[PDB]
From a paper:
RBD (244 vs. 287 vdw contacts and 9 vs. 15 polar interactions). In contrast to eqACE2/SARS-COV-2 PT-RBD, S494 is not involved in the interaction. Structure alignment showed that F374 of Omicron BA.1-RBD interacts with Q325 of eqACE2 and stretches the α2 helix of Omicron BA.1-RBD (Y365-N370).
In this study, we find that eqACE2 broadly binds to the RBDs of SARS-CoV, SARS-CoV-2 prototype (PT), pangolin-origin GX/P2V/2017 and GD/1/2019, bat-origin RaTG13 CoVs as well as SARS-CoV-2 VOCs. We determine the crystal structures of eqACE2 in complex with RaTG13-RBD, SARS-CoV-2 PT-RBD and Omicron BA.1-RBD.
Residue numbers in the entry:
A (entry chain A): 19 to 614
B (entry chain B): 333 to 527
Amino acid sequence: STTEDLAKTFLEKFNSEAEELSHQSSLASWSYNTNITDENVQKMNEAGARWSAFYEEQCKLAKTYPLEEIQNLTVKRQLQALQQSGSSVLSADKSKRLNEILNTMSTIYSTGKVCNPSNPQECLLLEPGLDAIMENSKDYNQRLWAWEGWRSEVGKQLRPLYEEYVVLKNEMARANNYEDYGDYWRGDYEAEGPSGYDYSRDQLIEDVERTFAEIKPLYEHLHAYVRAKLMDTYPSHINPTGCLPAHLLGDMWGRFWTNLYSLTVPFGQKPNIDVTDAMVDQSWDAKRIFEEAEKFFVSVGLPNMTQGFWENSMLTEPGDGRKVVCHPTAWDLGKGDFRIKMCTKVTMDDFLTAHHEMGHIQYDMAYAVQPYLLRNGANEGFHEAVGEIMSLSAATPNHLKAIGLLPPDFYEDSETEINFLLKQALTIVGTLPFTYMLEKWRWMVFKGEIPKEEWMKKWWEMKREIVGVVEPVPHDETYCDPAALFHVANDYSFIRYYTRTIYQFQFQEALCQTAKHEGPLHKCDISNSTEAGQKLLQMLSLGKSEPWTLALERIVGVKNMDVRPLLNYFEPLFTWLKDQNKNSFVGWSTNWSPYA
Amino acid sequence: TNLCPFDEVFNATRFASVYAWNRKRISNCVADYSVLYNLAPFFTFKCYGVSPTKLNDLCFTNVYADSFVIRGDEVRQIAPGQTGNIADYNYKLPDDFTGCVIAWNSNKLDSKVSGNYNYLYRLFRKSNLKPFERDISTEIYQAGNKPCNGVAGFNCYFPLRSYSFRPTYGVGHQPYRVVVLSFELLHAPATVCGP
Ligand SMILES: *[C@@H]1O[C@H](CO)[C@@H](O)[C@H](O)[C@H]1NC(C)=O
Ligand SMILES: [Br-]
Ligand SMILES: [Br-]
Ligand SMILES: [Br-]
Ligand SMILES: [Br-]
Ligand SMILES: [Br-]
Ligand SMILES: [Br-]
Ligand SMILES: [Zn+2]
């Protein structure tokens, strides 16, 4: 008996029904995604309905095997995965209240209109109207009414729904042994693996806070340099020693500072490296782009793309009347079926994302040797980090010279390097305080440390302090500005954008050290380093069969997050920013307001 | 010049399930081993104890041809000293096996868009097969200690599973047709020569 041995037989049977049932769901999902059709929606819905049906039956079967009786960690980790359902424990009357609220929040966000006070005929959605204003407008007042209007119209409607959402989500989490819903979300990082590879859910708060304190000095200098440049655009509204107003940061929420590049570029006389003209010059097509990506992974010792990858993928928008929504995705349908769905164009962007999506594919191929339930990234942040580091090596001048998109005589200016690092910091470094503060607010709200009379009082107190961002208009407790973001309104965890940012530079630095790359980390190119590939494969092949701490240690040597690789990546920019800010206030005072 | 019926074995319309593998006795004929071009892009020809080059020069008393269909990554199990579901429970070759194993991709013939569930294999068995044993039993597999009653009951399993074969599968999951040529030599007559 030894129920493990009984559970191995159950898992032996499960791995055949599950692996191919999940395949039918992918095929039906692929049919809709590559051919949008009323009929194809039904097949995808019904195939997924079958797959979700089976899976929840098997969970019951797997729950008749005491997890405290199994010695194989692999068998344990497989049985472990079949559990952990969610809102099923919630009562029937409370269950439909929750999914009522969720669909209400999702809809009023996606359909919410905001009307310009100067023109009542001008009422714009978020996409494409309000997004266009926040990403491109340089007028202070035009940005203000879109920012306030979005948080007033859709934000206030979400406020009472979110108060009920927090209460309901907490009760389901408490009925799952979790402290709160934030504690439930941190379960995606819990590891109970061997020896000192274990990772508690409470550790995530400490390790995120510890890492962010080491990122704060770099962010402050980026914050000060951006602030000093924004003075030349909004002189009447920018305090040189105060927080940046929220509605001037390049999007609706300040999540990314990417769109401040034009106003904040170090050397505007130097254009960014763009090999798009070269790619059209050499008459590249979509097939050539992925062939070059395949060569890049072959150069580091990784396998080629499968024959079915070329035959079955969608590497180009269909010209035969099939309607698809062009969104880059890399598919792992199972049973040896790997595909990429991209409307590839001949641009440097799609050249880079092709390496990113094929980076997803290489991860999927590597852990196919694992059982079905363990075929995933080590945690939720591993996959996107793996894809991102492929774009880093691909975009380097070192790689582009070897590929033939740059002249072998190419001269890269130090000014162009700083221009590139600054643009990276706006997206990468700018989002870190935004991501950390947002999830910290939600964590404390679920933890009950922020009373509902203080939701919008804390939110801007944390936004001023942690992010250095101040609201342009005072907001009472009728607002819900966190809910005015997609991820908060659509019941999605947000700390992944913080962890995978740290993971990717930990990955890249370790791979570049293995490749013995001399020089700044941001210039490293892991191409033609088979040694880097094996160290990468040591983690890719693991999948989710080991704790993410152990999988992290296999590639980078340490079993936890570390931001020094990130700071090492931005070190040339850090010294440049410090010189530029030696006559500017570095930091911010949380007392000043634009409405003071 | 009596030609041995190799067109029956290799170019058959349908092959047998590996658990119910098919053996075709061959005797008193002329064996022309040179007709096997590739009949597949991915194709395998492994011999043990005998040399396929100059194979149509020797003589044997009887030549048994075993045929079935397995997945691409189970082809390595059709070989001496191999372990795994196909070797352990479906078709086992001896350690001192003398003969050749011929495998080739059959995705065009055996894969169907709606899935081809006709090919089966044994997933559970109390013990490994002896070499060249054939088990077509359909008795319920008792994993636990409560007797399995003939059907409904916990920790019970039907011993046979279905190979689902869809054309978009990876090569390792695609159907491969296997022909195992066992060469038998009790010297004396050696009625199968094939110059
Ligand atoms: C099977 O058919 C093909 C073409 O029809 C032929 O070339 C080949 O020799 C045949 N195989 C056998 C074993 O006769
Ligand atoms: Br609009
Ligand atoms: Br796309
Ligand atoms: Br917290
Ligand atoms: Br906000
Ligand atoms: Br380095
Ligand atoms: Br040939
Ligand atoms: Zn991606």
